[PDB]
Amino acid sequence: KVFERCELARTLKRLGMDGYRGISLANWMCLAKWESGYNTRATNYNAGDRSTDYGIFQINSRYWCNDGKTPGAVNAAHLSCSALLQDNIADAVACAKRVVRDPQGIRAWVAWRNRCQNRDVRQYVQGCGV
Ligand SMILES: *SC[C@H](NC(C)=O)C(=O)O
């Protein structure tokens, strides 16, 4: 599903992302925008390393979700990448939380560094009531 900007912002607040490990909702929004255009169906195959990025946050199959086809990856005891292609983003949020629990935080996503860090990201949440 393709989320409307404010619909997404309110959803992320409800799932407790505002200020999670010091990350503002505006930062999480900036991240979803440049990663998938707020599209839960988004999939990006990295030919170079044979991994795939899945969902609204473009989570990778080598480190975080199991898809079976990715070489040198986390096993089948971990969350299925399919769970990140659902309309309901609860699993994706729970996984995004885990990713930033690493010392690297939100910097784990290179798109965040390019397009969001050291920027006025107020625009992503202005007028949403969050
Ligand atoms: S981010 C999803 C999570 N992955 C790892 C590697 O802990 C899981 O729930 O398995």
UniProtKB/Swiss-Prot annotation:
Keywords: Amyloid, Amyloidosis, Antimicrobial, Bacteriolytic enzyme, Disease variant, Disulfide bond, Glycosidase, Hydrolase, Secreted, Signal. Its main location: secreted. It comes from the Eukaryota. One of its GO terms (biological process) is antimicrobial humoral response. InterPro entries: Glyco_hydro_22, Glyco_hydro_22_CS, Glyco_hydro_22_lys, Lysozyme-like_dom_sf. One of its GO terms (molecular function) is identical protein binding. GO terms for cellular component: azurophil granule lumen; extracellular exosome; extracellular region; extracellular space; specific granule lumen; tertiary granule lumen. Residues 1-130 form the C-type lysozyme domain. Its EC number is 3.2.1.17. It catalyses: Hydrolysis of (1->4)-beta-linkages between N-acetylmuramic acid and N-acetyl-D-glucosamine residues in a peptidoglycan and between N-acetyl-D-glucosamine residues in chitodextrins. The active site is at 35, 53. Pfam families: Lys. Disulfide bonds join 6-128, 30-116, 65-81, 77-95. It is found in: Secreted. Lysozymes have primarily a bacteriolytic function; those in tissues and body fluids are associated with the monocyte-macrophage system and enhance the activity of immunoagents. Belongs to the glycosyl hydrolase 22 family. Monomer. It is linked to Amyloidosis, hereditary systemic 5: A form of hereditary systemic amyloidosis, a disorder characterized by amyloid deposition in multiple tissues resulting in a wide clinical spectrum. AMYLD5 primarily affects the viscera, and the predominant clinical features are renal dysfunction of varying severity, and intra-abdominal bleeding. Inheritance is autosomal dominant. Lysozyme C is capable of both hydrolysis and transglycosylation; it also shows a slight esterase activity. It acts rapidly on both peptide-substituted and unsubstituted peptidoglycan, and slowly on chitin oligosaccharides. This is Lysozyme C. It comes from Homo sapiens.
